[PDB]
Structures are given as structure tokens and as C-alpha cells.
Design a protein around this ligand. Structure first.
Ligand SMILES: *[C@@H]1O[C@H](CO)[C@@H](O)[C@H](O)[C@H]1NC(C)=O
Ligand SMILES: *[C@@H]1O[C@H](CO)[C@@H](O)[C@H](O)[C@H]1NC(C)=O
Ligand SMILES: [Ca+2]
Ligand SMILES: [Ca+2]
Ligand SMILES: [Ca+2]
Ligand SMILES: [Ca+2]
Lengths: 276, 96, 397, 397, 132, 397
């Protein structure tokens, strides 16, 4: 075991590839559904988690492997969403004016962000390149960024005057702020309430899928405006009844799990790179 | 001798008798990294024309090749029209 | 075996030159050779076959000498000649079949097939006629320690090998980079691919190398080098190296740049060709290093810019390839060709009579497994069986 | 040259025919030839080499004759003949190398290599044995003006060139039309591509033409014509003509309709084939005119209809291909081949001893330049050097 | 063949090309630095351009020596052959163009055509020794 | 070359046997041989040298025959013997040096050194005396193959290679497991190490395997096998595989259990030994497979228990090793030894005169590279120069 080394591997093309693995990824892994509370409110039941578990058992997943999680709504779930769970689905209802919040959450939970803390009070923070953002999470994240000249003097804003700063997020629960990569900035953000992390984007998180339960293709995980990729795991399904939505998920759970994959950073094989 | 113009044109030619030979790139590219390059104030074309019209000797041919001024002055003293024409060509090419 | 070749040559000349109407001046020397062969073989006895289904056959020679008084060959002559020639052709065919089915770990070049061992004796030295064909000439020039050479057109020097090396990979197999290659026959066909199109490589230039170690040295090889390896130039899905999953390959072919083809012998660069396609020449070489590069296009049309994004998805994967065809070459140890029938003839006569799988040759004479490890015992046995195959093919087609 | 080939022929025949046990009837004529060679070359001094790194070797001949009173050859005869034959073989090899390494701007056909120039004298006219080989026979048939011919397998006549022309284009490179083509050795592969799939062309057909002029007439050539040029039938990114920006290519391979191939000699149409693929023949042709057409298919299934819109994008580009391999031919002047090894021999001998780039041949004897520019002087020198290479290859491999 | 055999710069009148296969003429149009007002009126700075400046060169090959045969303005070999063909209405042959048209006979002058031309020219000289 | 050896043998026997007071009955045959040598070499001219700093020299022979009318040799006879033999010895020395300093990629067996080439004529076979030495005898046998073999004492068949592989590793190199080895000369020393003492191995047994691929088969070899590889039984710090960092190594030497050593030829096992130490034999082997194991000791005294914890730190790293000396063997091809100075003589002759590096041998006769790449051309040239040095050593030391 040669952890922490890029070692090339040679593979032939005459080799007969092996048998299926769905039975393994069901008998071992743990499916994990995150739904909004309005779902259960419309269902109006409470044996229904057990009923869904039994149907998943009919479909293959053992009894204890399928686990359910609730959340009040997308904006509240946005603050520190940690899916400590093996195969994640996030049902995400779509409503007008929450397009950007939905996109931010989709980016955050679909792409593996590795990140470091930020002392707003002390340093001036600069963004390296295309894959670096600052994510601010809290109850009221009012980030006020003031850019700095090469002499460390403000433009459009006075370092001693918080008012003239340029706001780029008001009272957001989650905010992926992207600034002009190449300039020092002085931030102010309400340190008692909202934490901020200088984060950058590793490869994708291939363990979490997002089922947009509502409308059109509005998710934009890539902050770049030129590219609007349609990832395999940003699924979208129409809805008029949460029972029908859940039945669709249960019926096609094989396909959703095929779309997803085991988390790379959770593997033992990633031990000495960024294993998590 | 392997000679190059700054505008692509290239030649290769013996010293004793200026009969040009097929150029050898990937030999010139290797040589020029290390060897002592020589400016070509007497271009290969004018040099060949001079040799054909006048018939310089081996020593004068080598000195013209190496742009030795001690000997290049001798032709301009002689009023050699080929070298004259070339040198006024450069002086008139020094416009702007 | 030289005596066996002499028998084959003199019977071939008997079948060709002795025809109805010929001057005897045309066939005087041949008739003298034929009569010498008849006298030497007369009174002897041979046993042939007895391995596999090849039946045991007894040969006893007692034949009348061909006449020599005739000025001009008539139909009476060729009838007697034909009667003797048919028997001799059958005998040589069976001896060659026996010798090219037999096999031996130790002392391969020595003759097996006790009929041929008898023919190697002292009585049958007088039948040595001439040794002009390429295979017997190499046999003699190698029996006496002198350099030998076989000219080959499309020599299948590479064992069949289709595979790939991944210098960067993930379980999702979404951002790969490495090389793929098929080496088969006289074809090397290698394609280096990069999913990010050298986005983060130093100076936006990915570097690819491919070694190919010939099992035996080649000489005066005429080679055909082209870009854009056509095999690895269409979409695929490929089973993973482990064999668990399968990954998607969707090539878009960039041009390979500053390609260097280095032909090596004992680790010393014998020849180097930088960005010189078309036909090329390798004077003598034992290994091939093909180095090429995937340089990101600095300037880009909007379409190609859309092809190559800065993000993760990478719906298209850049690729640059080379193809190298050994059109012809010269080698010491015997090989198989697209122009000679000796490998096929030996394999056919082995398959005919169900010869059991022997010590040195692989089962069924799989040439890939024979060439992948090419021990000196295998080389000796292969030269022996190929020489007998040519000797037999000189008469039996 | 004729004397040199005769020396090589008699030495090869002495190495083959003169073996132990052979009847004297089989070697009488060759022994007389060998004796005359010994007598005429006795007391003569040659000096080969002296250019590049080829060592300067002095040759002096003092050799005894060969017997005639034997009936069957034995070890003594063979041993003496072997000692003499090795010396002559080395001498001939060095003479051939000396003649191969040299060139001459004027008077190419006449000999170089003062050793061979001495051989050309009246004193050595008695050595000529028989000029059987194809190269020497053509040497004679051209030395006295008659109709020669060399038969070639895959004659690499076309100089390497992969390129394209654009009959409609614009800096965004979204709507192109034109042809791509790769000529390499014996194979042409031409693909006419239209990005609009002939939307506005007359009758929805776009005409493509590709004229390739050979540098030598090829007589009685068998050709394999097929559709769907392989190398231009997959996505690429290609430079601009000026090299500024790269443009995407994304072919969908329509078939070529009413395809004509015209084989032309001196402008006149010699042969013409009309939508007839497979094996074809060309009596003579100095040039080939491949004409074909991309016809928009009138009846489009919904899928292909989606592929080909009337709007601007044109996300997929229609193409129609042709591939054409000269499987064999006959030419009045020498060329490299996939079967022969003459070019390989010559280039290898030059590279071994680092002969400086000479007057006529390009550096490294690169066939692409050597066939792109094929002046009569270059042709004459190539024929001389190839004949010498064949003479060498008779004995040395 | 890319071999600069001769170069004559700023020379007119008779010259000698010892041996050659291509002629590479080069010249230049230099705008007059000074101008009489007539010439100034000829050449304006504006667009109309009533008068168009030109430079020229004539190059006549007086005599030459060619390895192969060629028609010439001295002997009547080509005329003799073409006359013999036209007088008797010989159909078109394989190699020669129709009518022995010299222009397309020399644009494409392959070795077969060249040797046939040599044969007919030698025969025509032989004939002209007797019949004129 | 047989003639050259015969010269050296007759000169050595003349210098030895022709001494004062010796009976003529002791030296009659030797005097006859010497007189044949004199008559054969008389009236000739040789030239030797002209490469590197080895200067040109010219040898001319006009010597009188030794007397024969003497019953018992006296002093005045041996002085004439001196005046002849010293000159002859000098001539032989320079011929041998000239032959050693030359090379040829092709047909290396045939003599270089035009002096020796002249000696290889027909007038000089009468000097052939007797070919008794091992090298000349094997030269004859190889040049007309019977099975041959040079007996070597402690032959340096391996190339100098010390290296290591890690089957388990971390970037901080806290917990390693793998093998280290040094193959040098006739010594293989291989030590497999585990930093956890096979704590988590299956059944607390860790399996180590090492493969050594001889460049040429060895026959009737004697191998001394012992445990405890010496070179890897003290603390070290080793540069990493990438070379970025260095990792500490702190052996604690456990014994190797169920050690197996398999000697294979062409892939099949020829000999196999298990837990056998001391001297052993290898019949005919081309590869060595040394398998051994690191078994965690079940019962552990307090001290060893303190040594081996179950936590990561692992201040002490368990290792088990083997040492293997090929004391003597028989090789069909030639190799350097520790008992024979042939390689030393060849290298010294090349070095003293600063010969330009030729096509075949590596720079400075670097034996490690030479045995690493030991192609047949290189082998033939090596055998030629070694037998020439063997001839030279009979007279010059
Ligand atoms: C794979 O499945 C086939 C039938 O689908 C079965 O015969 C075979 O044993 C299986 N192999 C493995 C390794 O499970
Ligand atoms: C941001 O500005 C407010 C003024 O409303 C100030 O009280 C607060 O301290 C500032 N934040 C930080 C982190 O200094
Ligand atoms: Ca938000
Ligand atoms: Ca402001
Ligand atoms: Ca940014
Ligand atoms: Ca976007």
C-alpha cells in the first residue's frame, strides 16, 4: 500500500470485465434521503418512513441502510450542510426567487470544497484563481468587501468607513462570494453571527445527488458564466404529489445510485491526499 | 558554411568553391547553439556573384566568409563593384 | 539438413527441367546429380513418422539410373523419370513433416526425426547439391559462425498487446490522463490522452513517452511514421485496470507536437527523428522510444474553446497519437512475415496430425506467446522447423 | 558496374554451389568462371574508402586457381575456396559501400569510387558472368537506350503531405467548406467536408476535386479504391492556414456520390472509373484526379434532420471521403518500396560512417525531399546507388 | 533545381546563362523622389489614379544548347513532321497531341513524348537531306 | 586467429624449452615447428597500429632457421634464439594489442587488424601448432559449434545494482514494508523489511520475493547461500523513491523462515531448495527466485516485546535477509571473473592508447553496462578480444 503517491497503473483491454456490483452497493452502503418538512406535512402520516423502508427492502436495500433526514427549508439547510452519510439524495423544491440559493447549495454539496479559515479583522484576503471562492455561512451573512489598490488604499470605499463598502450578499444564510481574482480585499462580516472560509474547489463530490422537484434547469454550479454544465447528479423531476415523488425515487433508486458513486475522499485509497 | 537570412531564406555552400549544397536543418539547429556565429555583411548571393565574375583566392574567400575587415577593406580599395554595390545597399537599407 | 535441401532442390529441378522435348544439353548436369542421388540412396532404408497421427512409413530405395544417351528428351524418358520422382517427392515430404513436428529443449539445431539423422550421416554427403535459397543460405552462414540475415516484409515482431497506462485517475474516471497503445504485427499505434487538455500542466504541455523493446534486433528497417493513431481515435468505453468498472473515452484529436522517435540499440541512440513523418530508416535498433506531446492550443476559436472548459465535466478529452509501421527490415533470428508461409505451414502440419503439445513451443504455436519470450532453445528449434518448412514448400504447395 | 555485379554473382554462386561432397558436374562452369576471375584480378591493387569515416583499405590479390581433376569435392577444395571467397566478399562489400557513399553533380550514371572506376577498364571485361538480377538488367537496358521497368509493391511515390484547402471560410470558422487530404507513400486519403451539408449549393450537391501529380509515370498499376477516408472521419482541432487560431472539426461521414477517379497521362484522360470501388487498374498515369460530390440526402429521418439544420450553428459537419492505395505498379525509374530494402541499405551505410551531406541527395536521404525534387541528376545517382546496393545485398545481409 | 547557377544584377544587353532550368526575374517600382509638375499631376495622393505606373523587362534567348530536342527558328524539322502528318490525315496517336501542337507538346514533355519526338525529328532530318 | 595462437604457443615453448644444455631430443619437434614458422613468416611485411595513440609500426621478417646438427644445445645456440624470439614476441604483442583495440558491430568474430587479417590467409595455415588453451579451444568449438563452456571462479555475472522497492509506504515513511537488494559481481544480498514486524499480515507472516534474471545461462554453478544479508543490517537513511526526502531505516534482524530458492531456466524450475544453506548447486539456470518470510515470533521475551509494539511509532524495524555467492560456474558465453585478467588486459590496452569509443562496446569497457546490455554482436566482439588477450598473456605479463 503506497498511499500518497501518483503511481501509474497498466490495464489491458482483452480482460473480461467482472460481474455486477449493485447487490454489494446495496447490502453494504447506506442510502440517505434529505427532504423538506413540507413533504411530510402534505403526506400527513408517520408510519410512512417505515413504509418507505419496507419498499426499499423490497427493492434490495437492507432494513437499517436507508435513513431519512428532514429540514425546514433550503435556505436554513444551507447553513453548514454536512451529509455524514454514505449515499446522499437531496430533494430540493424549487420556488421563484430562490434560484441563487438553490445554485449555491447545489455547488456546495456537489463539489468538494477544501478550505481554510479567514480572520477578517486582521488580514486582507486575495483570491488566487478560477477555483477559489469565499463561502460565508451563518444566520445573517452581510459581507461587505472593500477592494484595495496596490498601495492598500480603498477604491469606492474607505478602509475606516464601513458604509461606502460594496455589499455582495445581504442577510444570506449561505453565500459563495467570488471577487475579482488578483486584488487584495478588506472584508467586514458580523463576526458574532456568520463564519467565512476561504475555500477552493477540488474535483466533484460523486456521492450526493440533487433532485430538483420543481421547474426548469436553473442550477449553475459553475460560478463561471460562460459554462452552464448539466451534471449527471443534478436530476430534475416534476411534482404534484410528494407520494408520487417518493415512489419515483424508490422505483428508480437503482438508476440514481448508478448516477452517483462512492465518495473518492472516503476511500482508503485516498489516504494521504485529502482523505475524509 | 551554413548561412541564414532573417527572413527565412537559407543556404549552405562550400568555402574553397562556392557551390551550394542542400541545407541540413537539425544539424544547423544543433550547431548554432554552440558554434561562433558570423555576421554576413557580404551575403552569400553577392559572394558567389563576386567569385564567379572575379575569382577570388582561397585566403580572400575565407576572409570574406569571416567578414574580416583587414581584407574586406582591400576590395573597396580596389573599387570592386560587387562589394561596393552590397555596401551601399546596406547603407541605403539603413533608412528611418 | 543440407542434404535434405539438396534432395529437395534436385527433385525440383527434375520436375522442372526434365520435360518432354528438352535438349539433353539442358539437363546433363541435372541428370548427373539425379543419378548420384539414386546411387547414394539405393540399398538404404528409412523409417518416417510415428508421432501423433503421422503414420509410420517404410521407405526402401532401389531405382534404375536415368539414361543419358538421348540427344533430345522424348516421352519415354519422362515416364520413368516421373515414376522415380513421385516416390522421391513423397519421401522428402514425409521426412520434412516428421522433422518439423519433432522438437527438443537441448541442442535444437541438431536434427531430430531419425530419418533425417540418418541422412546427416557420411554416405549421404555426396548428395549435397547447392545451397542458394535464403533459408538454407542463412542456415549454412550460421552453421559456420558468420553473420546471417533474413529480409522481412511486414515482420510481426511485436507480440499482440493492447493496453493503457493511466498516470492520473480517479474512481469516477472523470479526469484521466495517460497513454493507450496497440502493438501488433508490424504496427505500433500509441495515443496519449488528457482529459483536461493540459490545463494545469507546466506551460500547458503534457509529455507522453512509450517504450517498445524488440525481442530481437532489427536491421535496415524501413518504417512509416504517421500522426493521428486511427485505432484510438473514436469513442470507447474501456474496462478499468482492476476490471471492476468501465470508463468512457471520448477523443478529440489534437496534433502531436515536437514528436521524437528514437531508435535505440543497447541503450545508445542509434537514430533520432524529430517531427519527420513519412518513410524513415533505422539502420540497426533493439528498442523504440516514441515521445510526443499534447500542447494546449494557445489561440482558440469559440467552438474549440467550448470544447475545452476550465471546469470539471470535460465532455470531450484531448488526444494525440502516432502510428509506426515497420514496412520492411532485416533480422538474424527467424521470424514470421506477411510475405512468407513458413509459420503457417509449420502450424498447419502440426495441427494436421494432432501432435501433442511439446516442451518449448507454446500450445498450438501461438506466435504471440512464442515471441513474447524467445529463449535461445526456442530460437534454435524455430530456425530448424522453419528451414525444413521452406525445404518442403519448395516442392509441396 | 557490370563487372562489379558479376563479381558479386560469382562469389554468391561460389559460396552456394561449392560445398563439400558436391559433384564436379554441378560446379564445373562456375569453377572456370572463378579461375578466370582469379587470373584477371591477380596482381592488381585497389584502394577503397577515404570519405567520411569509411576506413581506407588496401586490397592486393594473390590467389591460386582451383582444381579440375576431382570427381567429388572434399574438404581441401572447400577450404581453399573458402579462404579466397571470404577475401573477395569483404573486398566487394567495401567497393559497394565506397560507391554508395559518393555522389556527382554532373555525370551521375558514370562510376565514382576509383576502385570501381578502375574495375570499369578494358582489363576486367572478361569477368562479366550474367546480368540476371532485376536491377542490373535494368542498368543494362538503360545504359543502352531501351525500355526498362521496375516492379514495385506499394511504391511510395507520393511525398508525404497532410494539408487542406478551404473554398469558403471566415474567422469564426463556424461554416467552412473544402477538402482535407493526406498523401503518404502509396496511399491517398482525401475528404471533402461541408459544414452546411450543401444547404445552398446548386441542387444540394457540393463538388470536390483533388489533383495529385506523381513525379514519375506508373505503368500497369493495381489500385484499391474505397470510400470513407479513415483519417478525416473523426473530430479534430486543426490550425488555421496562417497558424493564428485553431478551428474545430466534427465529421459525419456521408457517402461520396457519383465519384469519378480519372487517371491521366500528359493531360489526356487515360482511364476513368465511375462509382466503381475495389481493385482497379491504371495503364499509365502521371496524375490522378479524384472528383466526388457531397449530396444532401433528400429523405432525412428525424435524427439526421436534427443533425443538419438550416440555422447558423452547424454543430456537426458533413463529410465525404475517398481512400486510394497503389497496391503495386511498374515504374521506369527506381523508387523505394515496402518490399525492398535498397533505400534502407543506402541510408544506413551513409549514417554508419557519417558521410557529409553531398551535392545532390538531401540530408539523411529523406525520401520526402528526394521524391519531391526528382531532377534527372538525382534520378541517375539514385539508380547508380540502388544498383550498387542490390549488388551488395546479393552477398551481404 | 534550386541551384543558383548565375545572378546578373543591374545588367542589360547580352548575358550568358551557363546552365539553368528556371529564370527568376526580379525588379522594383521606385516612386520618383522628385517630380516635374507634369509627373506630379500624373501621380496624385488621392484615389482616381488616371495613369498607372508600370515597369517592364524583355528577355530573349538568342541561342542555347539543350540535351533533348526542341523546335527552333533555324531548321524545319517540326514543320516537316507536321506537314507530313497533315498531308495524309494521320489520325491521333497515343503520345503526341493532335496536330503536333507544339504548345501542349512542350507543356507536358514526358520521356516517351521526348523520345518519339527525337525519332521523328531525326527521320525528318534524314528526309530533308534528299527531299526539300 | 588460430594461427596467431599458434605463433604465441610456439614462441612460448621456444622461450621455455630451448635452454642451454637441453638435449636435442627434448626440442626436435619444437625446432621443426619453429623452422616452419620462420619459413612461413619469412619474406613478408606486416603493419600494425594507426588507431588512437597506438602508433603505426612495420614488421619485416628475414631470419635464418635454427640449427639442427647439434646433439645437445649450448649457449651460442640460445643467443640466436634470443635474437629471433624477442623480435617475434614484440610483433605478436603489437598484433594482439591492435586486434584488441578494434571493433565491429557486424561479423565481429572475423579478425580486424589488417596484420591479423593477413595472418588469416592461406600461406599461414602451416603455422597451426596446437590449440590447447581453454579460450582457443572454445573458439574452435564455437566457430563450429559443439556445446562449449568456460569454467569461471566467482563470475561477475550480475551488474552492479543496489536498490529497493516498497510494497507499503507513506509520505512520512513511518510504516514501510518492502525489499532492498544489492547485486554486485557474484553476490546477491537481499533483505526484506517490515516496520510493523508483520503485525497485521495474514497469520503474522509477511512474504518477500526477489527475482534475479541472469543475462546468460549458467551451468553447473556452485552457490553458497547463507542468511542475514550483511549490507542491510545496520541503521541507514535512504533517499526516497522520488528522491524528494530521506527515510530512516533501523533493522532488527530476524531469521528468514521457510526460505525457498528456485533456479529456473526458460521459465521452468530446474532446481529448488528449501531451508538449505551452505553450498548448493544449480544445474542449468537463467533466473533465481529467492522467496522468504518474516514471521512475527509467537513467544516474546520482555525485551523483544518492548521492541515490537502494536502502535504506529515503530522505533525498530524488523528485517530478514539472505546472501548468495556464485562461487563458480560454467557459462557458454564469456564473462569476467575474479581469477582471470582478460577484461583487465583489454581495458588497459584501450585506456593506455585512448581509443575512440567504437560502435559496439560501451565507453571504457564499462563491464556493468556491458553485461546489462549483452546483445550477440557485443558478445562476439567480447569473445574475440578476450581470446586475443588470452593469446597475448601467454607471452606478455
Ligand atoms: C457472473 O455471472 C454468471 C452468470 O450471470 C455466472 O455464471 C458467473 O459465475 C458469475 N461470476 C462471478 C465471478 O460471480
Ligand atoms: C463591521 O462594521 C460595523 C459597523 O456597523 C462594526 O461595528 C463592526 O465591528 C465591523 N466588523 C468587524 C469584524 O470589525
Ligand atoms: Ca444563499
Ligand atoms: Ca462605494
Ligand atoms: Ca473569483
Ligand atoms: Ca455557470
Amino acid at each position: 500500500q503506497n498511499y500518497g503517491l501518483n503511481i501509474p497503473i497498466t490495464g489491458s483491454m482483452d480482460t473480461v470485465y467482472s460481474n455486477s456490483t449493485r447487490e454489494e452497493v446495496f447490502l453494504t452502503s447506506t442510502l440517505c434521503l434529505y427532504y423538506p418538512t413540507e413533504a411530510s406535512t402534505q403526506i400527513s402520516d408517520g408510519e410512512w418512513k417505515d413504509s418507505l423502508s419496507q419498499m426499499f427492502l423490497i427493492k434490495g436495500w437492507p432494513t437499517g441502510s436507508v435513513y431519512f433526514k428532514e429540514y425546514s427549508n433550503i435556505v436554513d439547510f444551507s447553513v453548514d450542510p454536512q451529509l455524514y452519510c454514505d449515499y446522499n439524495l437531496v430533494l430540493m423544491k424549487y420556488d421563484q426567487s430562490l434560484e441563487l440559493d438553490m445554485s449555491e447549495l447545489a455547488d456546495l454539496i456537489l463539489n468538494e470544497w477544501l478550505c481554510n479559515p479567514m480572520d477578517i479583522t486582521l488580514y486582507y484576503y486575495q483570491q488566487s484563481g478560477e477555483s477559489n471562492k469565499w463561502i460565508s455561512m451563518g444566520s445573517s451573512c452581510t459581507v461587505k468587501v472593500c477592494p484595495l489598490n496596490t498601495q492598500t488604499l480603498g477604491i469606492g470605499c474607505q478602509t475606516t468607513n464601513v458604509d461606502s463598502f460594496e455589499t455582495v450578499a445581504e442577510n444570506e444564510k449561505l453565500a459563495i462570494v467570488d471577487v475579482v481574482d488578483g486584488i487584495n480585499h478588506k472584508i467586514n462580516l458580523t463576526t458574532t453571527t456568520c463564519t467565512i472560509r476561504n475555500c477552493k474547489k477540488l474535483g466533484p463530490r460523486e456521492n450526493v445527488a440533487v433532485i430538483q422537484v420543481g421547474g426548469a434547469n436553473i442550477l449553475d454550479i459553475t460560478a463561471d458564466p460562460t459554462t452552464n454544465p448539466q451534471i449527471e447528479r443534478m436530476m430534475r423531476v416534476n411534482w404534484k404529489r410528494w407520494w408520487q415523488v417518493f415512489y419515483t425515487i424508490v422505483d428508480y433508486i437503482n438508476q440514481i445510485v448508478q448516477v452517483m458513486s462512492k465518495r473518492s475522499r472516503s476511500l482508503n485509497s485516498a489516504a494521504f491526499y485529502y482523505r475524509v | 558554411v551554413m548561412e541564414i537570412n532573417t527572413e527565412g531564406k537559407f543556404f549552405a555552400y562550400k568555402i574553397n568553391t562556392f557551390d551550394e549544397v542542400p541545407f541540413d536543418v537539425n544539424k544547423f539547429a544543433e550547431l548554432v547553439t554552440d558554434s561562433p556565429v558570423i555576421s554576413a555583411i557580404i551575403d552569400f548571393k553577392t559572394l558567389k556573384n563576386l567569385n564567379d565574375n572575379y575569382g577570388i583566392t582561397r585566403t580572400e574567400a575565407l576572409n570574406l566568409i569571416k567578414s574580416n575587415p583587414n581584407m574586406l577593406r582591400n576590395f573597396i580599395n580596389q573599387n570592386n563593384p560587387i562589394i561596393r554595390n552590397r555596401i551601399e545597399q546596406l547603407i541605403l537599407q539603413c533608412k528611418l | 539438413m543440407e542434404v535434405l535441401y539438396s534432395l529437395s532442390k534436385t527433385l525440383k529441378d527434375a520436375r522442372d527441367k526434365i520435360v518432354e522435348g528438352t535438349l539433353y544439353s539442358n539437363v546433363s548436369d541435372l541428370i548427373q546429380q539425379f543419378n548420384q542421388m539414386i546411387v547414394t540412396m539405393n540399398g538404404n532404408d528409412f523409417q518416417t513418422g510415428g508421432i501423433g497421427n503421422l503414420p509410420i512409413r517404410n521407405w526402401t530405395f532401389d531405382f534404375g539410373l536415368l539414361g543419358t544417351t538421348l540427344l533430345n528428351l522424348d516421352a519415354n524418358y519422362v515416364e520413368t523419370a516421373r515414376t522415380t520422382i513421385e516416390y522421391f517427392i513423397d519421401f522428402i515430404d514425409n521426412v520434412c513433416m516428421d522433422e518439423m513436428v519433432r522438437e527438443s529443449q537441448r541442442n535444437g539445431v541438431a536434427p531430430q526425426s531419425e530419418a533425417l539423422r540418418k541422412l546427416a550421416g557420411i554416405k549421404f554427403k555426396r548428395i549435397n547439391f547447392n545451397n542458394s535459397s535464403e533459408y538454407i543460405e542463412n542456415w549454412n552462414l550460421q552453421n559456420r559462425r558468420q553473420r546471417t540475415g533474413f529480409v522481412f516484409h511486414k515482420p510481426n515482431i511485436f507480440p499482440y498487446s493492447a493496453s493503457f497506462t493511466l498516470n492520473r485517475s480517479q474512481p469516477m474516471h472523470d479526469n484521466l490522463m495517460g497513454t493507450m497503445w496497440l502493438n501488433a504485427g508490424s504496427e505500433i499505434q500509441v495515443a496519449g490522452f488528457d482529459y483536461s487538455c493540459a490545463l494545469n500542466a507546466p506551460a500547458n504541455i503534457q509529455q507522453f513517452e512509450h517504450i517498445v523493446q524488440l525481442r530481437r534486433a532489427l536491421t535496415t528497417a524501413t518504417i512509416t511514421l504517421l500522426p493521428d493513431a486511427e485505432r484510438f481515435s473514436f469513442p470507447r468505453v474501456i474496462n478499468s485496470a482492476d476490471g471492476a468498472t468501465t470508463w468512457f473515452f471520448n477523443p478529440i484529436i489534437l496534433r502531436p507536437n515536437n514528436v521524437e522517435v528514437e531508435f535505440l540499440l543497447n541503450g545508445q541512440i542509434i537514430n533520432t527523428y524529430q517531427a519527420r513523418f513519412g518513410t524513415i530508416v533505422a539502420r540497426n535498433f533493439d528498442t523504440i522510444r516514441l515521445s510526443f506531446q499534447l500542447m494546449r492550443p494557445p489561440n482558440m476559436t469559440p467552438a474549440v474553446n467550448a470544447l475545452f472548459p476550465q471546469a470539471q465535466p470535460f465532455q470531450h478529452h484531448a488526444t494525440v497519437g502516432l502510428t509506426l509501421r515497420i514496412e520492411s527490415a532485416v533480422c538474424e533470428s527467424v521470424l514470421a512475415d506477411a510475405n512468407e508461409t513458413l509459420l503457417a505451414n509449420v502450424t498447419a502440419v502440426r495441427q494436421e496430425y494432432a501432435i501433442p503439445v511439446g516442451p518449448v513451443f507454446p500450445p498450438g504455436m501461438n506466435w504471440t506467446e512464442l515471441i513474447t519470450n524467445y529463449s535461445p532453445s526456442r530460437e534454435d528449434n524455430l530456425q530448424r522447423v522453419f528451414t525444413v518448412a521452406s525445404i518442403r514448400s519448395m516442392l509441396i504447395k
